[PDB]
Amino acid sequence: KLQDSLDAGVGNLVDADLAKESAKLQSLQTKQQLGVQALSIANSSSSAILSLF
């Protein structure tokens, strides 16, 4: 019983809660796509000046 409680305690110390990581994963994938889109918007600022010339 002592060996089982030491192993369960190691699991309390280091194990991930995977049900919570699933939510973090989905939101982070959406954030990465929005960040690529925002960088694409920032890249295009120079093209606006071409119209004046």
Partner 1 sequence: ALNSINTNSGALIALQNLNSTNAELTQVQQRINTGKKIGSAKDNGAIWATAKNQ
| Footprint of a copy of itself (CB under 8 A) | 18, 25, 32-34, 36-37, 39-41, 43, 48, 51-52
Q: Which of 20, 46, 51 has its CA nearest to residue 28?
A: 20
Tell me 33's DSSP state: H
For residues 40 and 46, give the distance between their C-alpha atoms in angstroms, rounded to a whole number: 12
Interface residues with partner 1 (CB under 8 A) are 6, 9-10, 13-21, 23-25, 27-32, 34-39, 41-43, 45-46, 49
We find the least distance from the C-beta atom of residue 46 to partner 1, in angstroms, to be 5
Q: How far apart are CA 2 and CA 7, in angstroms?
A: 9
Nearer to a copy of itself, 2 or 36 (CB): 36
